Amino acid sequence: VQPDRRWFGNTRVISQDALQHFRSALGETQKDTYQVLLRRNKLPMSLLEEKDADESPKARILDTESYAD
Amino acid sequence: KYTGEGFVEKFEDILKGFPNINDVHPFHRDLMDTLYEKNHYKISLAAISRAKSLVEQVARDYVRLLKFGQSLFQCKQLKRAALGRMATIVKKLRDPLAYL
Amino acid sequence: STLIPPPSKKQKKEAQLPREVAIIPKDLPNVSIKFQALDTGDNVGGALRVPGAISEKQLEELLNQLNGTSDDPVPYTFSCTKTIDITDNLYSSLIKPGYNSTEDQITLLYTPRAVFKVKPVTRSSSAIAGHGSTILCSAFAPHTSSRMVTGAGDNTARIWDCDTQTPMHTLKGHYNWVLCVSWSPDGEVIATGSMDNTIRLWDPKSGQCLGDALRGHSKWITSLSWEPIHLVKPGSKPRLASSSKDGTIKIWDTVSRVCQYTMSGHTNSVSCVKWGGQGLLYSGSHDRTVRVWDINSQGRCINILKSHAHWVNHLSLSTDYALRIGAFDHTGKKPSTPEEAQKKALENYEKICKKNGNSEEMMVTASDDYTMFLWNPLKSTKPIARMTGHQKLVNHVAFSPDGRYIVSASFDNSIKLWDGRDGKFISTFRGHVASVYQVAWSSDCRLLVSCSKDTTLKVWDVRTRKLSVDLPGHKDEVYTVDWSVDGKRVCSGGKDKMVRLWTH
Amino acid sequence: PQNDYIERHIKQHGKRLDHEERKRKREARESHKISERAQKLTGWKGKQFAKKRYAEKVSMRKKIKAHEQSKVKDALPTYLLDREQKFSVPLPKVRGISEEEMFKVIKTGKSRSKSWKRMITKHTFVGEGFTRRPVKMERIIRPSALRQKKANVTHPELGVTVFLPILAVKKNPQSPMYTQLGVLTKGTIIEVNVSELGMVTAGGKVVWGKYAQVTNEPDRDGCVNAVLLV
RNA sequence: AGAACUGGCGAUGCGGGAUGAACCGAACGUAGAGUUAAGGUGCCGGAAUACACGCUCAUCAGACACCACAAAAGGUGUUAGUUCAUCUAGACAGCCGGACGGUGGCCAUGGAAGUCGGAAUCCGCUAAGGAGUGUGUAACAACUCACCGGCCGAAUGAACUA
RNA sequence: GCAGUCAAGCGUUAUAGCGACAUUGCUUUUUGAUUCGAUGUCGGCUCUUCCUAUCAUACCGAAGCAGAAUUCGGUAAGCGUUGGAUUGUUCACCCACUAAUAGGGAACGGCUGGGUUUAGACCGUCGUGAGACAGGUUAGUUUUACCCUACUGAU
Ligand SMILES: [Mg+2]
Ligand SMILES: [Mg+2]
Ligand SMILES: [Mg+2]
Ligand SMILES: [Mg+2]
């Protein structure tokens, strides 16, 4: 592998405006039964899949009190 | 496969032995909650269950991988990798086992 | 860079098609409306008919005339309850969507607002060097936006002139990290609590140390709070409450430079201490409890509040902005005499505290059980509400200056906006990609600024509940952000050893 | 019996009359027993015994050091303390892998006379939307059990490892043919999704794709380990 | 794995290494006598159950290739060394005696007095004595050992190397 | 496995470099919830013996081992270690009995079924075709012993 500064730069970035556009779009989609997926777009889906949850997960009680205590 | 079965047998013996604290009579539930802290009790048994599932997954995955081994060296490395991952999973259980 | 999908041929054709102009019809009839105060729920004027060609300004003036306080009118914002605000006029806000018509009566809830306006910060005024280590804390002067105090990990603090964005003073008394700084509500002294278990006081104008350090803590200082000016009798200087990792809250009388009271009820490190406006001290500690002490009862722990299952990381009061600002305002006008300062601070406290019948000072506690609790400690020992929804620990929490909104900054890369009265969830500010460390309101309660682990600041508009502007520029994690009292400058500092000043 | 009945029985009746002397003599004999075990145990038991003895001696030396060290006598904020944690690539040269090792001949026909099919014996990345070719035209075989979608990527800064999804295979050092087949071997440059690392450019853009180099042999250890190129 | 040089072997028997493609010695007419090489000299088996100084005892030692198993790892086997210390104003073992006072230090606990825990770990008097090394009590008590002294009287202990 | 941390040592007088034992992160996160490509060899029957890396039987050690039962371990191979179901596959899973239903070598460096089954035939895929196969189904003669030895018995 030759030394090259192409190895250390960013390959994919996304703007805040594009992030907000995709975040708002995910939720406006009404899936039709007669539409098939031909090609899925490559996106930061981990950043885009943010749904408000009405409840929190349980607190980690082992952080405050161990088994030995 | 044999090592995975041994670990799963030990974990199943643990999980079947201990009472289900939420299904016993409420007097026994309250007494055991006072004695052993039901939160810790259920969390430790859930840790055992999760370790059992992870060990089964490791065994299945590495048997499927060993299906394509080309040499004795590669097959030995895959088997050692499976057993070492099982050992890591089991050693993560050091505290719940002492508590239990 | 990944782009949004381009418009299709049909969309381009529809865009080329002529547009429709939204114009008020000349034959728009009259509609009946009822004004209702959001804070008090007192109906004014009964039901009155108004033409459909009303504006927000004319509706505001009409409400002032109905109240009978036309000589000094107070601005308002109107909404209809979904709860949709009136943007420009009633027709285009409600009648145009068709949800409320001219036949049906429209009940408009009105909320008072600020006469001044804070423009959003949009660019970095300056990047200033001088600190030898990471900046750990920062604060603005209450009287002016031209002075900032910043305590860092090089065992020093700095006083920065924000007019020229140049260093003005260096405070070099401590031996370890300056963990907290605090400007006095009268603006006369800066208190720095450090990692070497000491507290020092500094005259800012001379940039000097007022004698020796305040010693007595066995672990590092975790928070400093000041006694309110509106409770300090005129001719006297406010006292300094200080919490620390050793589980104690020490009260310091600074004129005599002595330690009077030593509250000791906590079994673990105290996360924060706050001096309220009714002679009370609220302490949140890692022992999963909130302790309420009375200074008028020799510092005794009046209340122990236990609802969290983990450390309470932070706590905020409804009157926090007023107690920090004392007798000053957004104009920066100084009182003439200490009696005038005490009376003006009393009025500033009362405007936020005593509304809708009886004075209340709500508290919010953000914990490590991913939740917050909303309490009214004077009235009941039970929490008013439990705010849940955050996936990770709630690191910071803040009441708005008017006390009507609560903002929580969490480690799940999010900020949550909640109603300040009943604690009901309103909205989620998303856009940070790392944990949000702390947050700060603007003076007019319309804008919010947050600093994150992702090396960015973000300014959010509370009214539209969406991102206003994203400010990069820091080379590393940002640890502290503050907004000026007059709403002109924002200071930020973190691991890059630089102070960033931002302005519109 | 109920509760601590053995402790109560010892409290009420004592122990056996020779218990203390018997325990004392066993503890005295322990030194001879340890030496006899070390010189007499054979095979796996002897190896394990020696290993445990070495570990015990190391632990005892550490305890003595700690006692003597006790007897001789990052600048985080308040909300973060008491909370714990050239353009040269790290592998410029790796072992060369021939086509003979990379591929396995797959014979077809009733008498196994045709040998045009090849099977890739290493792990591969196929990407999104992969559909197997029809078997009549499937020359190169990438078995589904050897396909990979995620890798343990280590960031050199801040010293963390995250399970990240793979986006593409940028360069296999063995051959561009292996690059376009998606072979995942040691030294291969891959593209990884770094959305959860929270990286932001100086211009404000969120970085969600970067390069990493594979540092292990996934065909040997069952997993892909990679180091991010920062 | 790739280059360059040089040997050995095929075409070659003989002595030795138990046995043998590449190891040691030595190359070949038919014989006699003598001396040797490599290897050996308890018996098989020709030749000292020679001489000499040491080491080792293996509940399947070793008589070997000097590579691996091998972590220069484990061992209260044994031998020889190296460097540190203690010592007749008394070395190591052993027995006896002392091992105190503020003080049951603060918090916590139904109880917690050095010895369930969390933080201090200071002062006095000492020849010496921890705000305690362990056993023990529900808590105390009691015993211990950390340290000191009396009797005894001459070398001893630790860590490494081979 | 990869990437680190620590440091008993090793090395050095340049506080470089190797580095045992430990240890962290990812794989894998909390309330015990709820089958994915083995490209070339396999199974039986009868019957013998060996190994121990011991499932049971014998004797022991430890364990909150009261008793009963069970778990971990030591010496130990003398003696046993089964009957069945499933061919739309079993590189095994179930049911039961039982003291127990341990693992393995002497093949995998005599009958018998799957497979090295050639000539017949059909279907599928590819080929302009002769044909070949990603394949699927069905039918398809190899038959010593009186020799030596070994073994069992007999002069
Ligand atoms: Mg002779
Ligand atoms: Mg071996
Ligand atoms: Mg054995
Ligand atoms: Mg045929």
From Swiss-Prot, chain A:
The superkingdom of the source organism is Eukaryota
Q: Where in the cell is it found?
A: Nucleus, Nucleolus
In-chain residues carrying the UniProt-annotated modification Phosphoserine: S15
Which miscellaneous remark does the UniProt record hold? Answer: Present with 67700 molecules/cell in log phase SD medium.
Function, as annotated: GTPase that associates with pre-60S ribosomal subunits in the nucleolus and is required for their nuclear export and maturation.
**Which protein family is named in the record?**
Belongs to the TRAFAC class YlqF/YawG GTPase family. NOG2 subfamily.
Q: What is this protein called?
A: Nucleolar GTP-binding protein 2
* Whole-protein coverage range: 71 to 139 of 486
Swiss-Prot record, chain B:
Q: Where in the cell is it found?
A: Nucleus, Nucleolus
The residues forming a coiled coil are none
Q: How does it assemble?
A: Associated with nucleolar and cytoplasmic pre-60S particles. Directly interacts with RLP24.
The family this protein is said to belong to: Belongs to the TRAFAC class OBG-HflX-like GTPase superfamily. OBG GTPase family. NOG subfamily.
Q: What is the stated purpose of this protein?
A: Involved in the biogenesis of the 60S ribosomal subunit.
User: What does the record's miscellaneous section state?
Assistant: Present with 28000 molecules/cell in log phase SD medium.
Q: What is the name of the protein in this document?
A: Nucleolar GTP-binding protein 1
Annotated source species: Saccharomyces cerevisiae (strain ATCC 204508 / S288c)
Q: Which gene encodes it?
A: NOG1
Intact protein stretch covered?
51 to 150 of 647
UniProtKB/Swiss-Prot annotation, chain D:
Does the keyword Zinc belong to this entry?
A: no
Which InterPro entries does the record match to this protein?
Answer: NSA2_fam, Ribosomal_Se8/biogenesis_NSA2
Quote the subcellular location field of this record.
Answer: Nucleus, Nucleolus
- Motif Nuclear localization signal 2: which residue numbers? 50-57
Q: Where is this motif: Nuclear localization signal 1?
A: 14-21
Q: Name one GO cellular component term.
A: preribosome, large subunit precursor
Bias-annotated ranges (Basic and acidic residues)? 1-39
Quick one: a GO biological-process term for this protein? maturation of 5.8S rRNA
Please verify whether the record's keywords include Membrane.
no
Region described as Disordered: 1-42, 60-76
Q: Which Pfam families match?
A: Ribosomal_S8e (PF01201)
Annotated region (Interaction with RSA4) at: 74-85
Main location per the UniProt record: nucleus
Keywords from the UniProt entry:
Nucleus, Ribosome biogenesis, rRNA processing
Q: How does it assemble?
A: Component of the pre-66S ribosomal particle. Interacts with NOP7 and RRP1. Interacts with RSA4 (via WD repeats).
| Function, in words | Involved in the biogenesis of the 60S ribosomal subunit. May play a part in the quality control of pre-60S particles. Under normal, rapid growth conditions, high levels of NSA2 would allow the progression of pre-60S particles through the ITS2 processing.
Q: What else is known?
A: Present with 8660 molecules/cell in log phase SD medium.
The record's comment on protein family reads: Belongs to the eukaryotic ribosomal protein eS8 family. Ribosome biogenesis protein NSA2 subfamily.
Stated name of the protein: Ribosome biogenesis protein NSA2
Q: Which gene encodes it?
A: NSA2
